[PDB]
Amino acid sequence: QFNPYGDNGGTILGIAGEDFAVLAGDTRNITDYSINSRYEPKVFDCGDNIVMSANGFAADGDALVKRFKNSVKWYHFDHNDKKLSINSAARNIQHLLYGKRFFPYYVHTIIAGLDEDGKGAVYSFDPVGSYEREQCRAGGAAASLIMPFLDNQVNFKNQYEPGTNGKVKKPLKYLSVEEVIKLVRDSFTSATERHIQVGDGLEILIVTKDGVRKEFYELKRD
Amino acid sequence: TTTLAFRFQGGIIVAVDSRATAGNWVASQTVKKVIEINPFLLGTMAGGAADFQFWETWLGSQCRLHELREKERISVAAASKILSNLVYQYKGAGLSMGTMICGYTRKEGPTIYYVDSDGTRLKGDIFCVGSGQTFAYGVLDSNYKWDLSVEDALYLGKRSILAAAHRDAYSGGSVNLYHVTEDGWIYHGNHDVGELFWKVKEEEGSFNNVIG
Amino acid sequence: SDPSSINGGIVVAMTGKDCVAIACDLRLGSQSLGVSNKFEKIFHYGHVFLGITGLATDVTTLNEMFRYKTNLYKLKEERAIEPETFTQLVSSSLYERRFGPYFVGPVVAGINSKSGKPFIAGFDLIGCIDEAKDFIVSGTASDQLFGMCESLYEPNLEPEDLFETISQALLNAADRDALSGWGAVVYIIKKDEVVKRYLKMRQD
Amino acid sequence: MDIILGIRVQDSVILASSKAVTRGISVLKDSDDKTRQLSPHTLMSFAGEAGDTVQFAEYIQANIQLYSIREDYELSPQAVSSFVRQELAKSIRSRRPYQVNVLIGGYDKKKNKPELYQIDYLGTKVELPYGAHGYSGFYTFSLLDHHYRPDMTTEEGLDLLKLCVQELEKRMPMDFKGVIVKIVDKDGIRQVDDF
Amino acid sequence: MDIILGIRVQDSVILASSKAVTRGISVLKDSDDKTRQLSPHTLMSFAGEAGDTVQFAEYIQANIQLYSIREDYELSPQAVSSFVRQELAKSIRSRRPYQVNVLIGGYDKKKNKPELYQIDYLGTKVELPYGAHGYSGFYTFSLLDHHYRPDMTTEEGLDLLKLCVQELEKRMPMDFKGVIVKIVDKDGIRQVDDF
Amino acid sequence: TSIMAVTFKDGVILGADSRTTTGAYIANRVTDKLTRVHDKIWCCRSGSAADTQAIADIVQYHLELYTSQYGTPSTETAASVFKELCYENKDNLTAGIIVAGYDDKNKGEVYTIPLGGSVHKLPYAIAGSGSTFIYGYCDKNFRENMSKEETVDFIKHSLSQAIKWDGSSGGVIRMVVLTAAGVERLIFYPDEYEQL
Amino acid sequence: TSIMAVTFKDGVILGADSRTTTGAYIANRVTDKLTRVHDKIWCCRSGSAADTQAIADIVQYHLELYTSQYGTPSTETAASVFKELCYENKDNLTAGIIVAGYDDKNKGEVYTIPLGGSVHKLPYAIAGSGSTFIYGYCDKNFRENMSKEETVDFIKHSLSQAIKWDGSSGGVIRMVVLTAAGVERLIFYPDEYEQL
Amino acid sequence: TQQPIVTGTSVISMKYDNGVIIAADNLGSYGSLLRFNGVERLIPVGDNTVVGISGDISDMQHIERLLKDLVTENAYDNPLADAEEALEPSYIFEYLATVMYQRRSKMNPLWNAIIVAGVQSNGDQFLRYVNLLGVTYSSPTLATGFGAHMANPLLRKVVDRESDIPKTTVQVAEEAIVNAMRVLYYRDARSSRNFSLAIIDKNTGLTFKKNLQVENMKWDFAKDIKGYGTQKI
Amino acid sequence: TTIVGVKFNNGVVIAADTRSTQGPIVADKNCAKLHRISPKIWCAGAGTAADTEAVTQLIGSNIELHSLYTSREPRVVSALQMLKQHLFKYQGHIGAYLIVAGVDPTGSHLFSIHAHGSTDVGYYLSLGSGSLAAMAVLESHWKQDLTKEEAIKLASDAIQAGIWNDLGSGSNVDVCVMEIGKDAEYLRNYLTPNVREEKQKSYKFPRGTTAVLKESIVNICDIQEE
Ligand SMILES: *C(=O)[C@]1([C@@H](O)C(C)C)NC(=O)[C@H](C)[C@@H]1O
Ligand SMILES: *C(=O)[C@]1([C@@H](O)C(C)C)NC(=O)[C@H](C)[C@@H]1O
Numbered sequence A: 001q002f003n004p005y006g007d008n009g010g011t012i013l014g015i016a017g018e019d020f021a022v023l024a025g026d027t028r029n030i031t032d033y034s035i036n037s038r039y040e041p042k043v044f045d046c047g048d049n050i051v052m053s054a055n056g057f058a059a060d061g062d063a064l065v066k067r068f069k070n071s072v073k074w075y076h077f078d079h080n081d082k083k084l085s086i087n088s089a090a091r092n093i094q095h096l097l098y099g100k101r102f103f104p105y106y107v108h109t110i111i112a113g114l115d116e117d118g119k120g121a122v123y124s125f126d127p128v129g130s131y132e133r134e135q136c137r138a139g140g141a142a143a144s145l146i147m148p149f150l151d152n153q154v155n156f157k158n159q160y161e162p163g164t165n166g167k168v169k170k171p172l173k174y175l176s177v178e179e180v181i182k183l184v185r186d187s188f189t190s191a192t193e194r195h196i197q198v199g200d201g202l203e204i205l206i207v208t209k210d211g212v213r214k215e216f217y218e219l220k221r222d
Numbered sequence B: 001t002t003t004l005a006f007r008f009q010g011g012i013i014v015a016v017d018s019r020a021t022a023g024n025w026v027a028s029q030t031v032k033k034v035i036e037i038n039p040f041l042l043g044t045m046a047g048g049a050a051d052f053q054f055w056e057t058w059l060g061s062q063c064r065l066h067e068l069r070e071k072e073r074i075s076v077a078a079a080s081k082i083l084s085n086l087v088y089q090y091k092g093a094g095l096s097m098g099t100m101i102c103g104y105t106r107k108e109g110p111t112i113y114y115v116d117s118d119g120t121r122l123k124g125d126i127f128c129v130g131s132g133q134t135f136a137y138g139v140l141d142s143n144y145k146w147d148l149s150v151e152d153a154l155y156l157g158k159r160s161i162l163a164a165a166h167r168d169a170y171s172g173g174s175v176n177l178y179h180v181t182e183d184g185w186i187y188h189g190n191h192d193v194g195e196l197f198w199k200v201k202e203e204e205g206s207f208n209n210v211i212g
Numbered sequence C: 001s002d003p004s005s006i007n008g009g010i011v012v013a014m015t016g017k018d019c020v021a022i023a024c025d026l027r028l029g030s031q032s033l034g035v036s037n038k039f040e041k042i043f044h045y046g047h048v049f050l051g052i053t054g055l056a057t058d059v060t061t062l063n064e065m066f067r068y069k070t071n072l073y074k075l076k077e078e079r080a081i082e083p084e085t086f087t088q089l090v091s092s093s094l095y096e097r098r099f100g101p102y103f104v105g106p107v108v109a110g111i112n113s114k115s116g117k118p119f120i121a122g123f124d125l126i127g128c129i130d131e132a133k134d135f136i137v138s139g140t141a142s143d144q145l146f147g148m149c150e151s152l153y154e155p156n157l158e159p160e161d162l163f164e165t166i167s168q169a170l171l172n173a174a175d176r177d178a179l180s181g182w183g184a185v186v187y188i189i190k191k192d193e194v195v196k197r198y199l200k201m202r203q204d
Numbered sequence D, E: 001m002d003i004i005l006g007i008r009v010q011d012s013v014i015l016a017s018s019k020a021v022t023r024g025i026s027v028l029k030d031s032d033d034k035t036r037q038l039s040p041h042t043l044m045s046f047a048g049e050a051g052d053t054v055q056f057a058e059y060i061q062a063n064i065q066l067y068s069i070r071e072d073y074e075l076s077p078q079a080v081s082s083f084v085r086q087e088l089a090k091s092i093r094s095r096r097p098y099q100v101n102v103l104i105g106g107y108d109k110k111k112n113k114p115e116l117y118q119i120d121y122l123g124t125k126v127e128l129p130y131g132a133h134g135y136s137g138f139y140t141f142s143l144l145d146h147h148y149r150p151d152m153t154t155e156e157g158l159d160l161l162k163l164c165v166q167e168l169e170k171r172m173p174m175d176f177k178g179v180i181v182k183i184v185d186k187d188g189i190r191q192v193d194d195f
Numbered sequence F, G: 001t002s003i004m005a006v007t008f009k010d011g012v013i014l015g016a017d018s019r020t021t022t023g024a025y026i027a028n029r030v031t032d033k034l035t036r037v038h039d040k041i042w043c044c045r046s047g048s049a050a051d052t053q054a055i056a057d058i059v060q061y062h063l064e065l066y067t068s069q070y071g072t073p074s075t076e077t078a079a080s081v082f083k084e085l086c087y088e089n090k091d092n093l094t095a096g097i098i099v100a101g102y103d104d105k106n107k108g109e110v111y112t113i114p115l116g117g118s119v120h121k122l123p124y125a126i127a128g129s130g131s132t133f134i135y136g137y138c139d140k141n142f143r144e145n146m147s148k149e150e151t152v153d154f155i156k157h158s159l160s161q162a163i164k165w166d167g168s169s170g171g172v173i174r175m176v177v178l179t180a181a182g183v184e185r186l187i188f189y190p191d192e193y194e195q196l
Numbered sequence H: 001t002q003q004p005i006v007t008g009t010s011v012i013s014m015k016y017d018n019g020v021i022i023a024a025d026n027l028g029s030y031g032s033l034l035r036f037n038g039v040e041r042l043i044p045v046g047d048n049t050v051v052g053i054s055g056d057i058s059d060m061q062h063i064e065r066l067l068k069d070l071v072t073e074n075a076y077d078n079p080l081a082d083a084e085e086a087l088e089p090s091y092i093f094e095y096l097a098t099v100m101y102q103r104r105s106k107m108n109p110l111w112n113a114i115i116v117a118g119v120q121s122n123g124d125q126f127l128r129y130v131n132l133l134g135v136t137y138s139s140p141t142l143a144t145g146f147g148a149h150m151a152n153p154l155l156r157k158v159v160d161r162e163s164d165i166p167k168t169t170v171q172v173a174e175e176a177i178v179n180a181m182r183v184l185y186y187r188d189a190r191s192s193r194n195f196s197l198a199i200i201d202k203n204t205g206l207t208f209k210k211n212l213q214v215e216n217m218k219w220d221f222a223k224d225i226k227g228y229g230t231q232k233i
Numbered sequence I: 001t002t003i004v005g006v007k008f009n010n011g012v013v014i015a016a017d018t019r020s021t022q023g024p025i026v027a028d029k030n031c032a033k034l035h036r037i038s039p040k041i042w043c044a045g046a047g048t049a050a051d052t053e054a055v056t057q058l059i060g061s062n063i064e065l066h067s068l069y070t071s072r073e074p075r076v077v078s079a080l081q082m083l084k085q086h087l088f089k090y091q092g093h094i095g096a097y098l099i100v101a102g103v104d105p106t107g108s109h110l111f112s113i114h115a116h117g118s119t120d121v122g123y124y125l126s127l128g129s130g131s132l133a134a135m136a137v138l139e140s141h142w143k144q145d146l147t148k149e150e151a152i153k154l155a156s157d158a159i160q161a162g163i164w165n166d167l168g169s170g171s172n173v174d175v176c177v178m179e180i181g182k183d184a185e186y187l188r189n190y191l192t193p194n195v196r197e198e199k200q201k202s203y204k205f206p207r208g209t210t211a212v213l214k215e216s217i218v219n220i221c222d223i224q225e226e
């Protein structure tokens, strides 16, 4: 019997800052126990200061990103070159995904950017379109390895203030872009060590009011 | 998932948990299981998350078109039936939905309709839906009265979710409270179960089995 | 259906400077239903500590079995069993049930009384030994624990620092697992003193 | 069979067990006592597959009664529960396992303490203040979590038990034809004939 | 849903239908009315798969109400039952059939006679003095065979119906939370609020 | 089924057995598996008898209509029409067809069309259940530009062996010769080819 | 797997390819499928490698013990011991073994033992997946009382074709000659036999 | 949904300093039967692109006709068909990738794995993969089927990353490809000795090599190997 | 798992990677896959990790007793015969795939064993999920009459091919050289090309960060005197 789905592995990570947002993802692409490519870009600039990644089955992931980029283009034509806000992009992606409710895009989608007040924004989708704004979200193969670490080191979960003994929580102080990138890099370094589908390279897309910037870092190739 | 909604003297209380699970994996602790259909209608999330979000957002569009055409607020009966008739067309296809359509109108008063992906549509006073529904029902049934105060009703709904959050592995995270009046719903905050459990344990004297 | 994830639960072990640490959650369940918040998964035979995850009836059975075996060991050898030796005993005992195994994920931890060397080890259900220097993980949130341990851990931590690391590793891993939590315990083990600490965590 | 409950209070253990025996489409009996006295101060209730339940219960009963005669001494509830667990743990890897879940309520005369043990068919033992098997816990645990105190009297325990049974009678689809309630304390075992 | 009964006496038709709505492990409601008035002197009770039951009942109701307005005339119970049968007979060979069993109780104003029709989901129609769907008949038919007379009064019919419900409450495993009883006669349809 | 087509100096020769089996019962022991789609374009049929007959009948119709409009079709054209039917309906067909024909320009040509619907132009082709047992023999014994008598012997010996070992093949060995001279039918009986 | 044994004037010769495949991966391209159960009684192995090795090892043990008590065993005796194991354990074995040996009294003998466990004494035998493609060739080209050089050529040409068509067969062509003179091993490489 | 009948095995390829190399054997297998020995699985499009195809041959022949038809269609009303508006490797690939994903989405796939190798207008090397699922990826080395498992490791020793491409000459690259083809012949049970190789260079253009053979094979050591363990003779 | 064996002039060498995995998760990053059957007979295992460990210990134990009984150093063919007959008896259910190598009074030997009980002889062999990557290197660079230094290089290069290209293999390269008339040298972590880079941040917590309910001393000591 023909199986229309496949698993291309990979892992992605989105983190929303105070006035910025990052969307990172490893550059390894696999099937079963073989490496297809050590550098296959997974996170994309879709215009209007929005970045997107659709992790899982790469054919569906590429199809979706392609259709969303197309949706941005036609939004400009139909509505006098108006900028597509991140919340509007999120709703639009829901309809793209739910449009194939009974033959789904086998991907876990994440987009990132700035909201209309200029604050950092990350949205997270399931395969059939259910979405939600979040401060922190890892997706893909090593998502189970990364999320607990982010609960602890970003949201300071289970951390309390010395001397008080469980009475006073650690205050939720804001993280800089330099501080977030450190947590992203350590998340992927750790994930690479313990997950076979993660490695080769890390590509980070940083979104600010000034625009979209890229940063690349090497990962272990075993 | 634990969601409840019950009718009382002061309108309707809606209370839900916040946890989302894919197997044993806790996908999210901050999920919004109450959809704000419009300023006067609410809907709850159980079963399929996308199906709920998509079709009850769609429902809000249909309710808006109704009051534009008819120059009048849509009834809770009519709004619930639009959704139940829709999912009935999709019956067999594999939609997964269990929701309480909650509202307060002049002609009906406070009304709750349980709507199902099997096409079931039931009017009722108390409803609990989800993997932790039986735990919530226990607290509700033993403590429910029509003449509850808005303050006590809000607490009962909060406490009933807590009961389920504790025992049911697939429920927890935090509790979202809503209070539905004729002039619209009123949000009554997000309450972390971690902090709420200890607060309730001490103040209420309950959960003596658990060491704190 | 899957025996290793009916009851749920987790164990984690770590090494530090002249010390080891082993920790576990307290949940026992019947799939979605939480049954007990006092089901400890760490046991000890002399100065050798054993954590066991998986099917609860086997956890109990194996504890009783290793108590049985280490007691006879002590009577004949005229000394307490060591972590290295006990590890081999666990491996032997599991493999003899090769085609009808105990559905468990054991974890050994302790300090060798003669050499003073910190020791930890892990096993699969069938007896294969994983002897790591840094840390061992086991249970329904093992993926989460691997992620926490890999980032949080650094070598040669002092006992009181190691406590914080292993505790935060367990707590945050358990909170991302439906079948783990409902309390937690941490053992800090030194050559001639052992401190046991119950942790305060969310009860959902 | 269907519903079996247990609650350990200050000075006693209370076991409640349904009376219905349903075979397919018909309720053949509405007065069935799903329990056996293992020793003067130890009671075991049971629920599971037909035949296996009674066969297992009577088998355990005989073994404990044999021990009592041999040593002229009553085993502690803890000792009896450990014995029962081992038999079930032995059973689960047999050719045809016993499909039986049990609650063991006993009063330890040495320690002067009531004790409730919950053991499932796999041989999974837990000591609890209150317990249940099957779908029973799903309705009653939220009420027990709320109201239970370790210093409750026997009368207060029965009232909390009535509230549990009422909730079951309201929300369970199956008609279990009420429950037989039995109390285990320092004086032994007795049945509450009106409930 | 579960239990629906029907009995045709001298001058009326009596329909009894359970109040429980169970979804899986919980009884979501205990006051559900499993019936629709098709016309002033025709009542239809129903039981089957969730959703399909109400959807079908309301669909039939709308069609009969449409006929009543168009012709300014009430269709006979026989005519309504034949229409309903055809819809179910049409349904059984559809893509997704209606999984609904019905009883149609009506009073024919032309012939001055009560009439009870039993129709299953396949479109199998039978006119009867008394009828049931599902497992309900298995308990009640022996009692109805024994006691039923064609010249019974409405009060006698209700007493025989109580005896049927009592037998169901004794021997059925499921708790159906009692029944709503409705009477159809020359004066129309009314509900017996105490039963 | 044992079928083959072989090109040679003067043109091409098609060869086939005559056995048709339903399980182990021989439904027809004198079957004609060499069938005509045009004057000098024939085919050998293997697989489903219903499918291959239905296909061949459609091809004959297409080439008859082709001829009415555009004159005589090439062997390549006939093979293409076979392919189009076999490829586009691959899910519902079990047909292994060898197409053979004679032009004056192109001379003898052989195209084989296996289950998939692919086309393969070859000097000679073998197919059917019985072909498996003669891959070795045919490869060792085939030469290009053979004479008529040599090619008849090559086919006769080959199918003789295929018949000997394959239970699904048997009966008479039918052959059809395609040259400039015309169309010649040949038949060879068991008593002749078995003693080879 | 392509294996064969052929009797001739001076004795018997066993032949085999050297390919061992796990699916489409060639696990071993230089395998020795010609194995010794006694000084001048050898066998060719096809089917499960584990099964045929286990069987051959047991037979060697039986013939070693036979020799200690009753002197040199016949080729028929060796074939009988193979059969006994293959027949009595037919439900749990996948083994197709050709037994070949040389007596002075009986000279060259060949026994084939297919899956079932039956025994068939033959002038020559072919087996393995690759044998299907050379039934025609071997039947047409085999003669009784051939010379050593002729028999080597017959085997070399046969297995060459079997290798050519069968993906499961390949590598080198190993041979073992059994005569009064003794035991001679032969090997033939791809560059030699492919151009035949 | 179908099953592949007549199949083609590995296609292997890599980038070098001035262009790309691609290769594939000339076999059309029918299960374990090595049925057809003269099948060309490298199909050039224009003078700047070569499409290498593995998997089902009937579907390959269909794809071959689509590409032939694509060249015809591009020439229509196009004065610059042999110049600025000629078909690029990127155009040809994207077309195929669209078709492959559409066909998998109708549950009726072209049962193939395809590698499009070529050189763009600006001299840039193009090398990208697509298969029956519509999955696409690019890499300095690309290989299908068994090639992925055995060829890539060898080719990655030459070009391990992007920065190794300018350091790799056409002679070194071709040597690595030819060696890889030998290894596949040793170890792939559905391969043949005969193969075709194509080089697309930005300076010297398209060089298509037919009727190549695997040579310099090591088999001599086989004579020493005897039995399966204990056997000495 | 990538394991290889390579014959050379005066002996045999085996090598292996050091990654053990449970599904897609790496359990041990420095796993020891080279097992000792006897002092000069070693083997590398793939497949079910417990089975390969267990079956080598059992045969190794029996080989030791056999060596003591016969007053002779153990032979590789004995280890081979005992392993295959054991594995055959269990019809593949004991999932042990082994490359057995060693030196004995007969000479130097190299064999492979599969789970169903089949054995093979060779000058160069590879097993495991990375065997195809490793065999590609072996087929490209192997020759007759390799020196000790060349065989170690070839063996470790074959393992590296598995480490980099196969996801089932990784971390370090273990080697064991068995030369005739010499002690077998076990080179643990012969290569270390996968050290983790320094992290961007230290995650050492401030003391008193975790919330605690109870503390207590555990009594590990025996029952005391007086
Ligand atoms: C609840 O219904 C639930 C939640 O994950 C979603 C987010 C509503 N749905 C499920 O399928 C699982 C089992 C959860 O209970
Ligand atoms: C040959 O292919 C064959 C013939 O019966 C028909 C007449 C072509 N087809 C079959 O299915 C049987 C088995 C024969 O091989």
Ligand SMILES: *C(=O)[C@]1([C@@H](O)C(C)C)NC(=O)[C@H](C)[C@@H]1O
Pocket (backbone or CB within 6 Å): G001, G002, G019, G020, G021, G031, G033, G045, G046, G047, G048, G049, G128, G129, G168
């Ligand atoms: C031959 O029969 C064969 C060889 O691998 C072994 C070495 C005999 N057996 C098989 O299963 C494979 C497919 C080969 O045909």
Ligand SMILES: *C(=O)[C@]1([C@@H](O)C(C)C)NC(=O)[C@H](C)[C@@H]1O
Pocket (backbone or CB within 6 Å): I001, I002, I019, I020, I021, I022, I031, I033, I045, I046, I047, I048, I049, I128, I129, I168
């Ligand atoms: C290797 O064979 C392998 C290793 O984990 C062990 C340590 C030998 N075995 C496996 O099952 C996994 C998948 C690895 O390939």
Ligand SMILES: [Cl-]
Pocket (backbone or CB within 6 Å): F020, F031, F032, F033, F049, F053
């Ligand atoms: Cl025919």
Ligand SMILES: [Cl-]
Pocket (backbone or CB within 6 Å): G020, G031, G032, G033, G049, G053, H228, I118, I119
């Ligand atoms: Cl073999």
Ligand SMILES: [Mg+2]
Pocket (backbone or CB within 6 Å): A192, A193, A195, A196, A197, A198, A199, A220, A222
């Ligand atoms: Mg990795």
Ligand SMILES: [Mg+2]
Pocket (backbone or CB within 6 Å): C174, C175, C176, C177, C178, C179, C180, C181, C182, C204
């Ligand atoms: Mg948890």
Ligand SMILES: [Mg+2]
Pocket (backbone or CB within 6 Å): B164, B165, B166, B167, B168, B169, B170, B171, B172, C203, C204
């Ligand atoms: Mg919970």
Ligand SMILES: [Mg+2]
Pocket (backbone or CB within 6 Å): C035, D118, D119, D120, D124, D125, D126
């Ligand atoms: Mg239990």
Ligand SMILES: [Mg+2]
Pocket (backbone or CB within 6 Å): G163, G164, G165, G166, G167, G168, G169, G170
């Ligand atoms: Mg071959």
